[PDB]
């Protein structure tokens, strides 16, 4: 549960600590972060992460490895962060087609700024359930009209305008 | 030849349903022995008068069920003594008319009264059936003890029955119930005691003569007495005919299969009953076809010919039959056979030298009906598009019979003892009429047909009616076969009258009736009396005279009812109330659209989808009166306003509706230019459309107009869209469809990479989705929307229990709104598109039918007289075989959505779940058994609308203050369009939205299947978006060790886990948060 948070991949699993509201059953938000060294930039001597939560946030993906802040108060950089999607759709543009792996935003510039970071969140990763109360209550923003209303409101004429005149040329 | 090869190969597979046993056979010929060897022990008794025979045979444990009145010695003119029985091996068995159906059958006897009791002199005013029923209850005695040596008692019984629901003629129950048993052809028997042979005369069994002279033409004593005199001579002619005729007995299996088709049977038909053209029927209908002699005295057929020729042969002769109001026949011993074309308006076929109407027992009113159904099925014999040789032949008219009625008005006939008739009744018979019309259902029942007759005159496509209480079971203890039936000591509880009924023609209901002139039309004088009171002769358009029949029409109720309520209680009784509470209780479930007069106006009304329509033409017309720098080539609606057959109408200026909006697709002119990229051809074409977009606003602002990308379509989101919002605030989509989608998955699709290789044609896949041939398809739908007006309130009424259902959120929307349409189009093998409810069931059955993991579907899209010929659907079949041998489980294709205009069978049918689909036709059976179950009422209407909506992997149970019933035009006043575009989304319900995206994020492992119909699964809250959880085998359990294949591999086990079930409840906590009731893990 809590306090299995490793992963036999080479992933260290941060279990983020949520708060298990009547759309969940203290939830224990299952994702890891495998130490990936490949040609990608986020792979620059950071953890490439898997099992990516949904409802995703500015800094949701930092709260998931949020025992690391919430104990050792992570500061680092960032290089690159990638294979995280809303609903797999990304997979094929449509320019694209006309002419990791579940990472979610867990990765920094290299080891050495990520050792508050990156080798706290190992640390907490074997200290899941020793340091629950560091580790930071996921109680993300509820899902809002908002973000409805304005996905089937009505485009600005001029935002695809402009666009259109500078591509007739 | 193709048809005389392939009927007997389809007929075949159905014979062993109505196949016979050798041990069947056996076991019946040893019982027919020993009863004719019990019967031979019958003697002749004494000589005794009434009075003598009610010495013996008055207060007896055996006594035969006489004809009404009482047996009494009030008309004792003659004498009433046993004779000698005569018994014969003949009756059924004589040419193997039983047959073991599904539903079994019965056998006949040579029984007969003799000449010593029954006499010549005795037939004259119904004197003889008290002598014969004297004779049988003096014989009876003799029949319990000389003539009850079956010895079979164990497993068979013996008793007194009567036929064809008459107490004057009687069966004998002598069958193994479930040496003389007839357990193995668990069959029944019959028998009674008739008149001899020639004993009245045809004179005296004329139509002009009754034999109960108390006279008018007798309908049942006249043909009874004619039928029991010549059972023998026509058994024999008939047995003649089928010596002469080698394909005889396949004549009879066929005319056996189309009576069984049609409900029929040789019971009584005149006497308010379903019956006539049957076994009795079929047996001389055939015999005189094959000896020709028709209405021009012309050979109709002969004995040359084939088994599917006579079949075919006879189903055309039956469509052309001239009987009732067309012809009649008469026929001789054997010396000839002839008709004529005498149309008498009644069932009557008078034979020339047997002597007898073979029609008479049949009604003209029944013949309606059966003229009606014979000329579909003449129509279906003709038609060799469709392959359903085996499924029309074997389709039951009475199998579904809320699927077959459009309508039925039943009411309680409280009948009462004999002095107590008058109550509920007022069928005032006098002497001659009572002489025509003794009984309850055959009195009241002509009075009721008078009645609707001249009240709804044209209204009514055909009339059939039911007594039910009628007991079969005739008393030996009592008098006759006389129960409580309703609280009368006759036999006689209710009355049913199904409402055959042409649309066309009964589409009025406060209109001009009966047309009066300065001559004094005795129809249009007594308009005011037949329909009521309603129907008074008032002024017309034309500056005549015509009644003013009063009939309501509503939305929640049948007009049927209504109509029966005005012209019944002040025209003949207001002592029976015969209407149709299921019509009430579905049609007020259903939902209708929230405009004025929507309860004034009855379904077949659309003025309100027409004014929408009027109003998008006058749009478009501007629209193609204004022109461009940019030329366009067509603009052609097929959204809601072009349908006009939804699930609600188009209600007055709906806010924020599921389908507020009305998809108008607008084409350019050739415009090749642009590039093969999706975002450089939009761009490109884009110089005069943001121009059109803001003058769109200015020339047509009684309108609106916008520009936006529409996200609906897979992978593709770089458009420019109009969302067109009327001066009341209904809602458009003028959506411009390029041609950069079919270019690029044409000559374009060489750069897209092996993860984009099946998705190269997946863009021209989204496009031609909704707009390959929808604007063909619009334009054909105004046919067919105009022909069957009902098909549209058909097809609401399965998006409401769709939407009850919760079954119809995992599939597309084109091709569930053109599957309500096969049971109109195409009505056989069942009746066509009556009522709402008879639709929705109907629809059912053919999805039923058309078992997906079975037989994948096929339809053609034919005009009401366009039709696909066999070659063209041979390509359709050929997709359809080889999607299911593609996917045999239908996973990606469960059924096949076969057009004409979509020949792969795939084009609307693409991902939907095979364990949904199966789940949903598993209910939908389900549903459609427990409305059979449960009746015809309110609890039968919400059988198909009331879903469990539990034991899931999520329950359905939500709370959201997102409240947008008003919005959406669901009732528990905007007349504007809205300020802002995000206002009027905001307006609507988003947990609709947030549940879509929650399901669309989650479908491999956790989807939250709903309805497609939002609005009408809301009603009055229109808040709770209802997510039925359908988990995957990785939701709580352990998968592959696979953390490269992008899946929610994380710590629960050591690396072989799966998407974990705490993982996924906190991931969709904070999606859940703002609507959280009640979900968890799984």
């Keep these: 549960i809590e306090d299995i948070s490793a992963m036999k991949n080479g992933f260290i699993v941060v279990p983020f600590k949520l708060p298990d509201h009547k759309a969940l059953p203290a939830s224990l938000h299952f994702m890891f972060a495998k130490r990936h060294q490949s040609s990608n930039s986020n792979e620059s001597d950071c953890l490439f992460l898997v099992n990516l939560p949904l409802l995703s946030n500015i800094e949701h993906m930092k709260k998931f490895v949020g025992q690391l802040c919430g104990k050792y108060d992570t500061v680092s950089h960032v290089e690159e962060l990638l294979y995280n999607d809303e609903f797999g759709l990304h997979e094929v543009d449509l320019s694209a087609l006309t002419s990791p792996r579940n990472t979610a935003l867990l990765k920094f510039v290299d080891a050495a700024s990520i050792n508050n970071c990156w080798n706290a969140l190992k640390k907490y990763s074997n200290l899941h359930a020793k340091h629950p109360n560091e580790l930071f209550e996921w109680t993300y923003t509820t899902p809002s009209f908002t973000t409805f209303v304005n996905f089937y409101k009505p485009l600005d004429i001029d935002y695809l305008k402009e666009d259109i005149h500078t591509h007739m040329a | ?138 014989l009876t005695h003799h029949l319990l003890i000389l003539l009850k040596k079956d010895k079979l008692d164990s497993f068979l019984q013996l008793e007194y029955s009567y036929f064809d629901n008459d107490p004057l003629l009687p069966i004998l129950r002598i069958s193994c119930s479930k040496d003389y048993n007839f357990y193995k052809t668990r069959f029944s028997i019959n028998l009674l005691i008739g008149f001899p042979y020639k004993v009245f005369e045809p004179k005296k069994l004329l139509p002009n003569r009754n034999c109960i002279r108390i006279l008018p033409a007798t309908p049942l004593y006249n043909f009874s007495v004619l039928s029991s005199s010549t059972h023998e001579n026509y058994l024999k002619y008939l047995y003649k005919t089928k010596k002469q005729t080698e394909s005889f007995v396949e004549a009879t299996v066929l005319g056996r299969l189309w009576l069984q088709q049609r409900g029929f049977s040789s019971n009584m038909s005149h006497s308010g009953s379903l019956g006539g053209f049957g076994t009795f029927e079929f047996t001389i209908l055939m015999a005189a076809l094959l000896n020709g002699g028709g209405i021009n005295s012309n050979k109709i057929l002969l004995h040359g010919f084939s088994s599917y020729q006579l079949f075919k042969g006879v189903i055309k002769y039956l469509a052309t039959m001239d009987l009732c109001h067309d012809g009649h026949l008469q026929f001789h011993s054997n010396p000839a056979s002839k008709y004529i074309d005498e149309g008498f308006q009644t069932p009557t076929l008078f034979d020339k030298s047997t002597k007898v109407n073979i029609l008479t027992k049949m009604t003209v009113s029944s013949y309606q009906i059966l003229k009606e159904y014979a000329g579909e099925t003449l129509r279906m014999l003709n038609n060799v598009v469709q392959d359903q040789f085996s499924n029309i032949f074997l389709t039951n008219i009475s199998r579904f019979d809320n699927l077959k009625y459009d309508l039925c008005y039943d009411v309680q006939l409280p009948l009462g003892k004999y002095n107590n008739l008058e109550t509920s009744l007022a069928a005032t018979f006098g002497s001659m009429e009572r002489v025509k019309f003794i009984t309850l259902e055959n009195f009241l029942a002509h009075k009721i047909t008078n009645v609707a007759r001249y009240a709804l005159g044209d209204r009514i496509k055909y009339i059939q009616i039911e007594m039910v209480g009628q007991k079969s079971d005739f008393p030996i203890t009592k008098r006759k076969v006389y129960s409580n039936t309703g609280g009368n000591h ?287 398809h619009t334009r054909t739908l105004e046919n067919i929307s105009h022909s069957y007006q009902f098909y549209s309130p058909v097809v609401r009424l399965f998006k409401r229990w ?269 999606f859940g948060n703002d609507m959280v009731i009640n979900f968890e893990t799984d």
């Design chain 2, 490 to 776: 006759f036999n006689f509880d209710f009355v049913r009258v199904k409402l055959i009924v042409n649309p066309s023609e009964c589409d009025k209901l406060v209109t001009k009736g009966p047309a009066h002139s300065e001559t004094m039309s005795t129809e249009a004088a007594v308009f005011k009396n037949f329909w009521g009171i309603k129907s008074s002769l008032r002024r017309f358009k034309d500056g005549s005279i015509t009644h003013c029949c009063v009939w309501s029409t509503s939305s929640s109720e049948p007009i049927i009812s209504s109509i029966v309520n005005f012209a019944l209680q002040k025209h003949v009784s207001k002592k029976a109330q015969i209407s149709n509470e299921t019509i009430k209780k579905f049609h007020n479930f259903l939902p209708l659209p929230n405009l004025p007069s929507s309860a004034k106006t009855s379904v077949l009304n659309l003025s309100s989808f027409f004014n929408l329509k009027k109003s998008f033409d006058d749009l478009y017309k501007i629209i193609f009166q204004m022109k461009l720098p940019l030329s366009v080539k067509s603009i052609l609606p097929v959204g809601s306003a072009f349908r006009y057959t939804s699930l609600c109408q188009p209600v007055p200026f709906a806010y924020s509706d599921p389908d507020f909006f009305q998809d108008v697709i607008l084409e350019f002119e050739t415009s090749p230019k642009w590039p093969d990229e999706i975002t450089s051809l939009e761009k490109a074409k884009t110089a005069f459309l943001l121009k059109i977009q803001e003058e769109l606003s200015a020339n047509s602002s009684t309108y609106r107009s916008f520009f936006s990308r529409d996200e609906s379509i897979p992978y593709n989101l770089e458009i420019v869209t109009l969302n067109i919002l009327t001066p009341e605030g209904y809602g458009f989509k003028f959506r411009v469809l390029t041609e950069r989608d079919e270019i690029l998955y044409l000559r374009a699709i060489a750069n897209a990479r092996n993860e984009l290789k099946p998705e190269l044609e997946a863009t021209f896949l989204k496009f031609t989705a909704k707009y390959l041939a929808s604007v063909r």
């Design chain 2, 802 to 1070: 769709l939407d009850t259902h919760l079954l119809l959120g995992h599939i597309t929307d084109e091709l569930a709104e053109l599957i309500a349409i096969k049971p109109f189009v195409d009505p056989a093998p069942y009746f066509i598109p009556g009522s709402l409810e008879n639709g929705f069931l109907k629809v059912l059955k053919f999805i039923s039918q058309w078992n997906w993991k079975d037989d994948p579907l096929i339809l053609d899209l034919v005009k009401p007289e366009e039709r696909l010929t066999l070659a063209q659907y041979k390509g359709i079949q050929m997709n359809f075989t080889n999607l299911r041998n593609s996917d045999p489980n239908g996973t990606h294709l469960q059924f096949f959505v076969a057009s004409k205009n979509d020949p792969s069978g795939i084009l609307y049918s693409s991902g939907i779940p095979l364990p949904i689909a199966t789940r949903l036709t598993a209910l939908a059976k389900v549903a459609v058994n427990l409305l059979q179950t449960h009746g015809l009422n309110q609890q039968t209407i919400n059988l198909l609308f009331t879903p469990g909506l539990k034991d899931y992997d999520f329950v359905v149970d939500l709370r959201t203050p997102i409240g947008l019933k008003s919005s959406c035009g669901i009732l528990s006043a905007p007349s504007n369009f809205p300020e802002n575009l995000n206002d009027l989304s905001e307006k609507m319900d988003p947990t609709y939205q947030l549940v879509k995206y929650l399901n669309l994020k989650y479908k491999n492992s956790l989807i939250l299947s709903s309805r497609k119909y939002i609005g009408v699964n809301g009603g009055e809250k229109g808040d709770k978006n209802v997510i039925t959880g359908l988990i995957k085998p990785l939701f709580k359990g352990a998968h592959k060790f696979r953390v490269n294949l992008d899946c929610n591999v994380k710590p629960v086990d050591d690396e072989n886990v799966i998407l974990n079930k705490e993982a996924i409840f906190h991931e969709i906590a904070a």
């Design chain 2, 1 to 138: 030849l193709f048809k005389s090869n392939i009927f007997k190969l389809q007929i075949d597979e159905l014979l062993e349903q109505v196949k016979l046993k050798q041990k069947h056979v056996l076991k019946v010929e040893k019982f027919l022995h020993k009863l004719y060897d019990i019967l031979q022990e019958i003697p002749d008794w004494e000589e005794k008068s009434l009075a003598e025979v009610d010495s013996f045979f008055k207060n007896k444990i055996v006594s035969v069920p006489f004809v009404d009145p009482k047996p009494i010695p009030q008309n004792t003119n003659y004498k009433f003594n046993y004779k000698k029985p005569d018994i014969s091996l003949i009756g059924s068995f004589a040419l193997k008319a039983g047959i073991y159906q599904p539903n079994g059958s019965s056998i006949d006897t040579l029984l007969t009264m003799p000449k010593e009791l029954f006499e010549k002199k005795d037939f004259l005013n119904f004197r003889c059936l008290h002598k014969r029923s004297v004779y049988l209850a003096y």
